[PDB]
Amino acid sequence: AMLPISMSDEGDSFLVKDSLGENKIPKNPSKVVILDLGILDTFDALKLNDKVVGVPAKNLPKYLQQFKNKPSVGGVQQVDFEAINALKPDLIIISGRQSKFYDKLKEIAPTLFVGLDNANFLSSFENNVLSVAKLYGLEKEALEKISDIKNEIEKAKSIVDEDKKALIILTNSNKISAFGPQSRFGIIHDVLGINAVDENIKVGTHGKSINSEFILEKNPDYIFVVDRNVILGNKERAQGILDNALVAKTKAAQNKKIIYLDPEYWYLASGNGLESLKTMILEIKNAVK
Numbered sequence: 338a339m340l341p342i343s344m345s346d347e348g349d350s351f352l353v354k355d356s357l358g359e360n361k362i363p364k365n366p367s368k369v370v371i372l373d374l375g376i377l378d379t380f381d382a383l384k385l386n387d388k389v390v391g392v393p394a395k396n397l398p399k400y401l402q403q404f405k406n407k408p409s410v411g412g413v414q415q416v417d418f419e420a421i422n423a424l425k426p427d428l429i430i431i432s433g434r435q436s437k438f439y440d441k442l443k444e445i446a447p448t449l450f451v452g453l454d455n456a457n458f459l460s461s462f463e464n465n466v467l468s469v470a471k472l473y474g475l476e477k478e479a480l481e482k483i484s485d486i487k488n489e490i491e492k493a494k495s496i497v498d499e500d501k502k503a504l505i506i507l508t509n510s511n512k513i514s515a516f517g518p519q520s521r522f523g524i525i526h527d528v529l530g531i532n533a534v535d536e537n538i539k540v541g542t543h544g545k546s547i548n549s550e551f552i553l554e555k556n557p558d559y560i561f562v563v564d565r566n567v568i569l570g571n572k573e574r575a576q577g578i579l580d581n582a583l584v585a586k587t588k589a590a591q592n593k594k595i596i597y598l599d600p601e602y603w604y605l606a607s608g609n610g611l612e613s614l615k616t617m618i619l620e621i622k623n624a625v626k
C-alpha cells in the first residue's frame with residue numbers, strides 16, 4: 338500500500354509527510370495552487386474557494402467553471418512553472434500526473450502529494466480529504482461529507498446485479514484500451530462491486546490495448562466508456578468508434594448498457610474529490626439500477 342499522509346501539529350503550521358517527502362505547511366494556507374482537479378472540488382465543497390490562487394485552466398472541467406477567473410498554471414500535463422512562481426503560493430497540491438516535477442515544484446513552495454492508491458481507493462481518498470481538511474480545521478465538515486458518500490456507496494451496492502459482468506474501456510483517437518479491478522477506474526469493480534468480465538486485465542496508466550473482437554468475445558453485459566478524446570480535444574468520439582457491427586452484437590449494446598461516463602470526472606478528477614466522487618457513484622448507480 339502507498340504511504341499515507343501523516344501530520345504533526347506545529348502551532349502555526351503542520352509538519353507533513355507523504356509518499357514523496359516532507360514539508361512544513363502553514364495552517365489555513367491562503368494561496369494554494371491546485372493541480373489535481375479532484376482536490377479543487379474538495380476546496381469548493383469545504384467553501385475554500387478564496388484560498389485558491391491558481392488552477393490548470395487548460396483542463397478545467399465544465400463542472401468546475403466557478404474557477405474560470407483564477408489565474409492559470411497551464412494544464413495537468415503541461416505545467417507553467419513561471420506562472421506558479423509568480424502567484425507566490427503558500428502551498429502547491431499535486432497528484433500522480435506531476436510527481437515527475439516534484440523537486441522543481443518544491444523549490445517554489447511546499448508541495449503536498451495527494452495521489453490515489455489504486456489498490457486502496459477509499460482508504461487513500463479519505464486520507465487525502467482529511468489531510469486537506471486538517472490544514473483548515475475542517476475535519477468535522479469533511480467527515481460528514483465522507484459519511485454521506487459511504488452511505489451512497491452502500492445504496493449503490495445493494496442494487497448491483499450479481500449475475501452481470503462489466504468491461505471498462507478508454508477510447509483514444511481510434512484506439513481502445515481496457516481497464517479492470519485495481520486500475521484508475523477500478524471503483525466500479527472494487528468499491529461498487531460490479532463484477533469484471535475479465536479479472537486478469539493487467540493494470541497500466543493508460544490501459545491495455547484491445548479491439549472490438551475482444552469486446553465481442555467477452556460479451557459483457559455493461560461497457561463503461563471513458564472518452565479520452567474529449568479531454569485531448571480530438572475530433573474522434575467514442576460513439577463513433579463503438580458503433581460497429583461487432584460491438585452491436587454484445588449484450589451491452591443490445592440492452593443500451595454502453596455507458597459513456599463523463600471523462601472530466603473519471604479521467605481528470607479520477608474521483609479524488611468530495612464532489613466528483615459522489616457524482617461518479619450516482620452516475621454508476623443510475624446506469625445500472
Ligand SMILES: O=C(NCCCCCNC(=O)c1cccc(O)c1O)c1cccc(O)c1O
Binds near residue numbers: 413414433542568569
Ligand atoms: O505521467 C502521465 N502522463 C505523461 C504523458 C502521457 C502522454 C500525453 N498525454 C496527454 O497529453 C494528456 C493530457 C491531459 C491529461 C492526460 O492524462 C494526458 O495523458 C500520467 C500519469 C498519471 C495519469 C495520467 O493520465 C497520465 O497521463
Ligand SMILES: [Fe+3]
Binds near residue numbers: 543
Ligand atoms: Fe493521461
